[PDB]
Design a protein around this motif. Structure first.
Motif, PDB file in Angstrom:
ATOM      1  N   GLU A 185      37.739  18.401  38.829  1.00  0.00           N
ATOM      2  CA  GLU A 185      38.508  19.301  37.975  1.00  0.00           C
ATOM      3  C   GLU A 185      39.949  19.400  38.450  1.00  0.00           C
ATOM      4  O   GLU A 185      40.888  19.335  37.649  1.00  0.00           O
ATOM      5  N   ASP A 186      40.138  19.584  39.759  1.00  0.00           N
ATOM      6  CA  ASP A 186      41.475  19.819  40.289  1.00  0.00           C
ATOM      7  C   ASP A 186      42.385  18.612  40.098  1.00  0.00           C
ATOM      8  O   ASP A 186      43.594  18.776  39.901  1.00  0.00           O
ATOM      9  N   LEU A 187      41.836  17.399  40.145  1.00  0.00           N
ATOM     10  CA  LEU A 187      42.671  16.211  40.016  1.00  0.00           C
ATOM     11  C   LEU A 187      43.343  16.170  38.651  1.00  0.00           C
ATOM     12  O   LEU A 187      42.722  16.457  37.625  1.00  0.00           O
ATOM     13  N   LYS A 188      44.613  15.776  38.641  1.00  0.00           N
ATOM     14  CA  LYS A 188      45.412  15.744  37.427  1.00  0.00           C
ATOM     15  C   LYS A 188      46.056  14.373  37.271  1.00  0.00           C
ATOM     16  O   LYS A 188      46.007  13.530  38.170  1.00  0.00           O
ATOM     17  N   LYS A 189      46.661  14.158  36.107  1.00  0.00           N
ATOM     18  CA  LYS A 189      47.208  12.865  35.725  1.00  0.00           C
ATOM     19  C   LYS A 189      48.714  12.821  35.968  1.00  0.00           C
ATOM     20  O   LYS A 189      49.396  13.848  35.933  1.00  0.00           O
ATOM     21  N   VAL A 190      49.225  11.612  36.221  1.00  0.00           N
ATOM     22  CA  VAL A 190      50.663  11.434  36.383  1.00  0.00           C
ATOM     23  C   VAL A 190      51.362  11.737  35.066  1.00  0.00           C
ATOM     24  O   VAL A 190      50.908  11.332  33.988  1.00  0.00           O
ATOM     25  N   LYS A 191      52.474  12.458  35.149  1.00  0.00           N
ATOM     26  CA  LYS A 191      53.335  12.730  34.003  1.00  0.00           C
ATOM     27  C   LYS A 191      54.584  11.871  34.167  1.00  0.00           C
ATOM     28  O   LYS A 191      55.505  12.228  34.910  1.00  0.00           O
ATOM     29  N   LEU A 192      54.601  10.729  33.485  1.00  0.00           N
ATOM     30  CA  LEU A 192      55.699   9.788  33.607  1.00  0.00           C
ATOM     31  C   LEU A 192      56.920  10.289  32.836  1.00  0.00           C
ATOM     32  O   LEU A 192      56.815  11.201  32.014  1.00  0.00           O
ATOM     33  N   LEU A 223      45.842   8.464  36.616  1.00  0.00           N
ATOM     34  CA  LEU A 223      45.538   9.578  37.503  1.00  0.00           C
ATOM     35  C   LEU A 223      46.417   9.521  38.746  1.00  0.00           C
ATOM     36  O   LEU A 223      46.667   8.447  39.302  1.00  0.00           O
ATOM     37  N   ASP A 224      46.896  10.687  39.177  1.00  0.00           N
ATOM     38  CA  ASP A 224      47.776  10.777  40.342  1.00  0.00           C
ATOM     39  C   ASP A 224      46.919  10.699  41.596  1.00  0.00           C
ATOM     40  O   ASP A 224      46.444  11.707  42.121  1.00  0.00           O
ATOM     41  N   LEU A 225      46.727   9.476  42.084  1.00  0.00           N
ATOM     42  CA  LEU A 225      45.906   9.214  43.256  1.00  0.00           C
ATOM     43  C   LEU A 225      46.732   9.001  44.519  1.00  0.00           C
ATOM     44  O   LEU A 225      46.173   8.613  45.551  1.00  0.00           O
ATOM     45  N   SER A 226      48.044   9.244  44.464  1.00  0.00           N
ATOM     46  CA  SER A 226      48.887   9.023  45.636  1.00  0.00           C
ATOM     47  C   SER A 226      48.485   9.933  46.791  1.00  0.00           C
ATOM     48  O   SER A 226      48.572   9.539  47.959  1.00  0.00           O
ATOM     49  N   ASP A 227      48.038  11.154  46.482  1.00  0.00           N
ATOM     50  CA  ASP A 227      47.682  12.105  47.529  1.00  0.00           C
ATOM     51  C   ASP A 227      46.458  11.653  48.318  1.00  0.00           C
ATOM     52  O   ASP A 227      46.323  11.994  49.498  1.00  0.00           O
ATOM     53  N   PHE A 237      37.038   6.551  42.575  1.00  0.00           N
ATOM     54  CA  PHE A 237      35.688   6.955  42.952  1.00  0.00           C
ATOM     55  C   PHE A 237      35.701   8.261  43.740  1.00  0.00           C
ATOM     56  O   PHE A 237      34.990   9.211  43.392  1.00  0.00           O
ATOM     57  N   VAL A 238      36.517   8.337  44.796  1.00  0.00           N
ATOM     58  CA  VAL A 238      36.512   9.529  45.642  1.00  0.00           C
ATOM     59  C   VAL A 238      37.101  10.723  44.900  1.00  0.00           C
ATOM     60  O   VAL A 238      36.619  11.855  45.039  1.00  0.00           O
ATOM     61  N   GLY A 239      38.137  10.493  44.088  1.00  0.00           N
ATOM     62  CA  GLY A 239      38.765  11.559  43.330  1.00  0.00           C
ATOM     63  C   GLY A 239      37.844  12.248  42.349  1.00  0.00           C
ATOM     64  O   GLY A 239      38.059  13.422  42.035  1.00  0.00           O
ATOM     65  N   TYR A 240      36.824  11.545  41.854  1.00  0.00           N
ATOM     66  CA  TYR A 240      35.804  12.108  40.979  1.00  0.00           C
ATOM     67  C   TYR A 240      34.663  12.747  41.746  1.00  0.00           C
ATOM     68  O   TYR A 240      33.619  13.049  41.156  1.00  0.00           O
TER      69      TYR A 240
END
Length: 207
Positions: A99-106, A121-125, A197-200
């Motif tokens: 839920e907490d994970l959010k998408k990149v806003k280009l 998805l913003d996976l940089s973190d 995978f981990v983000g989900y």
């Protein structure tokens, strides 16, 4: 030369509790594909033209041509089955983490002529585990084979200069002879693959 042979995933069931995470993996491959093409200078046309940098599939994943949705699913399924083939284990750990994970806003200019704006998805973190970076590398090389195997079976051959005249590509090479940059680009697209995978709230390990 050359004989591209990847991991044998033919003895690998995709268990049903991992079919949904496949879907969001494929969807995010598209958003990363759209993002990367726009950064190169490609724009939306209705028919593919490499002169005007116009691609037809540069649209929302919900509206891709019905065969090309399957190719992204096939790309995602194979990276998933390759995991189980390699003996990695994937676990649906916490359902809620997603839920907490959010998408990149280009920025604005990434919006295309037809209104499509890629939002990966913003996976940089996410920092992956060291035992997973080595698995990323082993999947970045195997990804080069699934592509090289599928292209050759589609009649593709090596070519000093890239040409669509008759399926000539200079990157149709044994992984040993690829360029560094292409190699790093594949670890990137598949480093992003493991982060989805981990983000989900799904966990995998290397043994």
């Amino acid at each position: 030369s050359f004989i591209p042979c990847p991991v044998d995933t033919s003895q690998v069931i995709l268990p049903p509790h991992l079919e949904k995470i496949r879907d969001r993996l494929a969807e995010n491959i598209h958003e990363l594909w759209g993002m990367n093409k726009i950064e190169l200078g490609w724009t939306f046309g209705k028919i593919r033209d490499d002169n005007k940098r116009q691609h037809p599939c540069l649209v929302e994943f919900s509206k891709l041509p019905e065969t090309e949705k399957n190719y992204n699913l096939q790309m995602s399924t194979e990276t998933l089955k390759t995991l189980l083939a390699l003996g990695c284990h994937i676990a649906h750990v916490n359902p809620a983490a997603e839920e907490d994970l959010k998408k990149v806003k280009l920025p604005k200019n990434y919006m295309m002529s037809n209104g499509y704006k890629p939002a990966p998805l913003d996976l940089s973190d996410v920092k992956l585990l060291p035992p997973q970076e080595i698995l990323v590398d082993k999947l970045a090389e195997n990804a080069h084979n699934v592509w090289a195997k599928d292209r050759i079976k589609q009649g593709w051959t090596y070519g000093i200069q890239q040409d669509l005249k008759n399926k000539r590509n200079p990157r149709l090479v044994p992984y040993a002879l690829l360029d560094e940059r292409t190699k790093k680009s594949n670890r990137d697209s598949l480093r992003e693959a493991v982060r989805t995978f981990v983000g989900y709230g799904y966990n995998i390990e290397p043994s």
